[PDB]
Design an enzyme around this catalytic site. Structure first.
Site, PDB file in Angstrom:
ATOM      1  N   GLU A  27       0.840  -1.187   0.000  1.00 46.88           N
ATOM      2  CA  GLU A  27       0.000   0.000   0.000  1.00 46.88           C
ATOM      3  C   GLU A  27       0.881   1.245   0.000  1.00 46.88           C
ATOM      4  OE1 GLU A  27      -1.819  -0.875   3.731  1.00 46.88           O
ATOM      5  OE2 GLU A  27      -3.469  -2.049   2.852  1.00 46.88           O
TER       6      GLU A  27
ATOM      7  N   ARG B 214       4.256   1.172   2.080  1.00 47.49           N
ATOM      8  CA  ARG B 214       4.229   0.120   3.096  1.00 47.49           C
ATOM      9  C   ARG B 214       5.243  -0.934   2.649  1.00 47.49           C
ATOM     10  NH1 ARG B 214      -1.175  -2.775   5.716  1.00 47.49           N
ATOM     11  NH2 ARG B 214      -0.266  -4.853   6.062  1.00 47.49           N
TER      12      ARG B 214
END
Ligand SMILES: [Cl-]
Ligand SMILES: [Cl-]
Lengths: 520, 519
Positions: free
Chosen positions: B374, B390
Site C-alpha cells: 500500500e 508500506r
C-alpha cells in the site's frame, strides 16, 4: 462430471426457516448447470408436516482453502445474535422452492452457470412450527442432472431417518449473546423445566454477567413459555453485574412434594477472568464462589430469593465448591441429592455428592468419589445405591463409582474408565424404573459427545445391566456435527426420553426420542 | 496508593461516555474513595461539556498477568450497535455532574472496596454540537480514601485532549464493521469519507463488502446518511458474500470537481482472503477487477461501475489493486492513483497509475520498489511525484520519487529511516504555500507512529519536502491500539482533516489546526 453429496445426522429444528438437508459439492467447468435434482421423501414420512423444500447455490470454493469440504461457510448460523433461524443471505442464493402441500417426489431446478472449480449447492427443508417432536424425515436424492444429462451421485454420508427438534434458546434471544450449561427435569405434573446460564455478553464461563434462566413447557416440548430468570445477583454490594455472575445450574424435582430446586455458583468480583482460577480459600463472597439455592413451589412458574448454603457444605481450605451442572435427584427413600465438585487445598478438583434428608433445608457433603474429576451426574442405580458418573481430567473416558452411605465411602465401578468414552466434557445419566417405562425393565440412560476427539456425535446410550455394558444397538446419534457438547436427559413420559443439549444447530436444543427406538 | 492514567485518545462528540481517566487502587476490604477532584483547564469552554461521571468497575482478578488500568474495555468500539455508552455490565455510576459544568468538579463514592486492585474511572460527555477544534485539558489534583488525602502516582498524563466524531461505528446501518478510510475535500469544500462496508465481520475480501461514502457539508460536524458508492450484489447469480468490492481510494479531479473512487471487485473465491485467491488472468472468474465510479454532483450520486482492468493489468499478475486512501490531481491536470500488484514471481510491488484524459483511459508503467504494498502519492514539487510505501521488510516506510509518471524511480534520502512503521497503511498529502495559513509548502503524513503494533496514530509535518519530520511538528491523536489506517485532507486554509480507524471508532474524523503542528 461428478456430484458429491453428504447428509449428516443433525437435528431439523421445527422453529427454523431453513435446515441443511443435503450439501452438494460439484467439481465443474465454467458454464455447467445443475438443471435438476429429485428429492424423494420416504413413504412413512408425514408430508403435511413439511412447509417447504429449497435449493440454494453458494458459489465456489477458494483455491487457498485446505482440505476438501461440503460448504464454503456455515450456511445457517447458531452463533450470530438474532440471525440463527434462516439461511444467511450473504452466502446462499435461492434457486428453487416447493411449498406445502408437498407430494412424495419433489423436483428442484437451477439455471445457474457454474464457475470453473468446486461449486456448492445445498437443499433446505422447513417443517411447520406445530410439527410433532417425534416425527422423522426419511429422504433420498435418486436423480441429479448437469447440462440436462443424468449424473450418478457419489455419496459421502447418508442417514436413514432424520429427527426433528426445537431450538428453545438461540444466539441473541432476549438480548443474550449465548446460552449454555443445560439441565432438565420433568415435574410431578409432567411439566418440562429446562435450566441454563444466560450468558449475556459472550459464551465464556464465569466470571461474567451471567444469570440462571428457566424455560418451561406444559406440552412435552412442543411450545416453551417465555424465559424466566430463576437466579440473578445484579449489582450486589455495588459491584457491576459483570462481577456478580451466577452459573452452571443443576436442577432437581423433590418428587415427594413437587418442589423444584436449582443450585448454582455465585461468583463475586474476580475481574473478567475465569472463576475457576480466581475462587480462593475462605468462605465469604469476596474470597470464594458461593453455593446458592432457589426453590419453586408452583411447578417452576415463580422462584424464591437465593438461599446461601456455602457454610453448610464447603470446607474453608477449598478453592472452589460448586454443583455438577445438569440435574440432581430424589432417592427412593426421599433423600434429595445433587452432584458437586471441589478444588481442594492441593489445587486438585474432585467429584462427589451432597444431600438433604429434610426436603432441602439442610445439606451434607462427605468425601470425594475420585481425584482429579470435575463435572458429574448421579443416578440411583439400585435402591440406596448412588452411582456417580464423572468428567475425568485423565482424558478418554468417564469415571464411575458408587456409594451406599451417601458418599462417606466409594467403590469404583467395573465400567469406570472403559465403558463410556469422552473428550473431557459434561455428560448426563438418569435411572428409569421398570414400572415407569414402556420396556418394563430398569434402565440407565446416558448422553454425551460419543468421541475422544472434540465435542460431536451427541448420542443417547441405554444400559439394561446397571451400567456394566452400553450396547451399540441401544444407542441413538442425534447430532453428528461439532457443538459445545453439554446435555441433560429426563423422561417426558413412560414412552419418551427428552434431551436438552448444546447442539451444532442451537445453544439450547430440545429433542424427544421414543424408548422403542433405543430398545428394539 | 492510587495509580491514575490518562491516554491521548479521542473524546467523541457523538458518544455518551468517553474515558477521561482510569484509576487502579490497591485497597483493603471496606476502603472508600470518598472524593476525587477534576480541575478543568482555564482555556476550556465549559459550555461544550454535557457531563462528567465517576464509575466503579469492581476488582481485578488475581490470575491476570501484569498491571492494568481496567478489567475490561469499558466502552466498546466492536459490539454491533453498542459502542456509544459505557457498558452497564462492567461499570456502576457513583456520581455525576451535568451541564452547566463548573471549572472544578468534585465526584464522590460510598462504595466499600474489596481487598485487591479496585477500578474507578472518570467519563466525560460532550454535547453533540461541540466544535471539532475544541480541546479539553484537565487534571486530577486531589483524591481521598477513607476521609484522608492519598498521593496519586501518575502513569500517563496528557496536556490537552482532542475531540472527534465517530462517523462510522460497529453495527451502524447493519454492518458489523467498517475499514480502509479515504478522504478528500471537493472544490465546494465538501468532505467525502470513503470506506469498506464490511457487513459480516472485520475480514478483508472475499466477503460481502460494499464501498460507502459519508459526505459532510459543515467541515465534519455532521455527516449525511451513508451512500453506497459501489456494490456488486448478486452479479452472475453468485452470493453477495462472493461478490465483495473493497480497499477504496478516492480522488478529486480538481480541474472539474469530478470525484473518482477506485476499488477492487472480487468474484467467487469462497470465504477466504483475496490476497491468496486472486489468480493470473483477466476475467472476474480468475482475478480481482479494478473498478471505477464517478460523481459529477459533489459526491451525492455515483455512476455505474467502470471496469478498467484491461487498460492497466498484465495477465501474469495475481492481483492488481489500488493503494487504499486517496489519489491526486497533479498541477498539470493528470489524475494519479497509487497502485499495487502481485507479479508472476508472487512478490507485491507499489507503483502509480495515471490518466491524462480526465479519467477516461488509465496507464501504468513500472513498479517503484519490490516487496512493497500500500502506498500514497503526493506531488512534492511541480512535476515530481513522491510515493510513500508500506514495506514488507518492516520497521520503516519506503519513499521514492518519479518525474515521468513511474517509468523510472529515484529512492528518496528519507526512505527506510525517517518514518518508522509496523507495516501498515500511511497517508501523505502536499499542501502548497498559497493554500495554507503557514505560507510554506508542507507535506503532511499520518500513520501508527510505532514499529510494534498499531497505535500512537500521529500527524507529522515536513517543511523540507519530506527529508525531515521534526518531533516538534507532530500531533499524537490516538495513543491506544486500533486497526491503524488513516487518510488526510486539508479542510480549509487553516485546518487538516484526518479520517481514520481509531481505538474509539471504526471511522473517526478529527480536525487539527496547522498552528498546532507548525508553531
Ligand atoms: Cl472450464
Ligand atoms: Cl441474511
Amino acid at each position: 462430471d461428478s456430484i458429491y453429496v453428504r447428509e449428516q445426522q443433525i437435528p431439523i429444528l421445527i422453529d427454523r426457516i431453513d435446515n441443511v438437508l443435503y450439501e452438494m459439492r460439484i467439481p465443474a467447468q465454467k458454464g455447467d448447470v445443475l438443471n435438476e435434482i429429485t428429492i424423494q421423501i420416504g413413504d412413512n414420512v408425514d408430508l403435511s408436516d413439511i412447509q417447504a423444500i429449497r435449493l440454494f447455490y453458494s458459489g465456489v470454493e477458494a483455491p487457498s482453502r485446505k482440505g476438501e469440504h461440503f460448504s464454503p461457510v456455515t450456511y445457517i448460523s447458531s452463533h450470530i445474535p438474532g440471525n440463527t433461524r434462516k439461511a444467511l443471505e450473504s452466502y446462499s442464493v435461492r434457486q428453487d422452492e416447493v411449498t406445502a402441500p408437498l407430494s412424495r417426489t419433489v423436483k428442484l431446478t437451477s439455471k445457474q452457470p457454474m464457475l470453473k472449480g468446486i461449486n456448492y449447492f445445498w437443499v433446505s427443508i422447513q417443517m411447520k412450527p406445530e410439527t410433532s417432536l417425534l416425527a422423522k424425515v426419511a429422504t433420498t436424492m435418486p436423480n441429479a442432472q448437469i447440462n440436462n444429462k443424468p449424473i450418478n451421485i457419489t455419496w459421502k454420508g447418508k442417514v436413514d431417518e432424520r429427527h426433528v427438534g426445537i431450538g428453545v434458546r438461540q444466539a441473541g434471544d432476549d438480548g443474550s449473546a449465548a446460552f449454555r450449561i443445560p439441565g432438565l427435569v420433568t415435574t410431578n405434573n409432567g411439566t418440562l423445566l429446562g435450566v441454563y446460564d444466560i450468558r449475556y455478553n459472550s459464551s465464556v464461563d464465569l466470571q461474567e454477567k451471567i444469570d440462571i434462566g428457566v424455560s418451561r413447557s406444559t406440552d412435552k416440548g412442543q411450545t416453551w413459555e417465555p424465559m424466566r430468570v430463576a437466579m440473578t445477583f445484579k449489582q450486589t454490594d455495588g459491584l457491576p453485574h459483570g462481577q456478580n455472575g451466577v452459573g452452571d445450574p443443576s436442577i432437581l424435582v423433590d418428587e415427594k412434594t413437587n418442589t423444584i430446586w436449582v443450585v448454582a455458583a455465585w461468583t463475586h468480583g474476580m475481574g473478567n477472568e475465569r472463576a475457576w482460577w480466581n475462587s480462593m480459600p475462605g468462605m465469604t463472597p469476596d474470597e470464594t464462589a458461593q453455593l446458592m439455592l432457589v426453590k419453586s413451589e408452583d411447578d417452576g412458574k415463580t422462584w424464591s430469593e437465593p438461599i446461601n448454603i456455602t457454610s453448610q457444605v464447603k470446607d474453608p481450605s477449598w478453592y472452589f465448591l460448586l454443583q455438577g451442572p445438569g440435574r440432581g435427584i430424589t432417592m427412593q427413600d426421599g433423600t434429595l441429592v445433587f452432584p458437586i465438585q471441589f478444588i481442594d487445598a492441593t489445587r486438585v478438583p474432585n467429584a462427589g455428592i451432597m444431600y438433604s434428608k429434610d426436603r432441602g433445608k439442610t445439606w451434607h457433603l462427605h468425601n470425594l468419589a475420585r481425584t482429579n474429576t470435575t463435572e458429574a451426574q448421579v443416578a440411583e442405580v439400585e435402591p440406596g445405591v448412588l452411582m456417580l458418573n464423572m468428567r475425568d481430567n485423565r482424558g478418554g473416558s468417564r469415571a464411575v463409582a458408587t456409594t451406599k452411605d451417601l458418599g462417606k465411602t466409594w467403590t469404583e465401578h467395573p465400567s469406570s474408565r472403559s465403558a463410556l468414552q469422552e473428550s473431557v466434557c459434561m455428560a448426563s445419566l438418569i435411572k428409569v424404573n421398570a414400572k415407569d417405562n414402556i420396556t418394563g425393565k430398569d434402565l440407565l440412560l446416558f448422553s454425551n459427545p460419543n468421541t475422544t476427539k472434540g465435542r460431536n456425535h451427541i448420542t443417547i446410550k441405554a444400559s439394561l445391566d446397571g451400567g456394566l455394558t452400553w450396547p451399540t444397538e441401544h444407542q441413538v446419534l442425534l447430532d453428528e456435527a461439532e457443538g459445545w457438547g453439554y446435555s441433560c436427559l429426563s423422561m417426558i413420559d413412560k414412552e419418551t426420553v427428552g434431551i436438552f443439549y448444546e447442539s451444532s444447530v442451537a445453544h439450547m436444543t430440545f429433542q424427544a426420542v421414543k424408548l422403542q427406538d433405543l430398545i428394539h
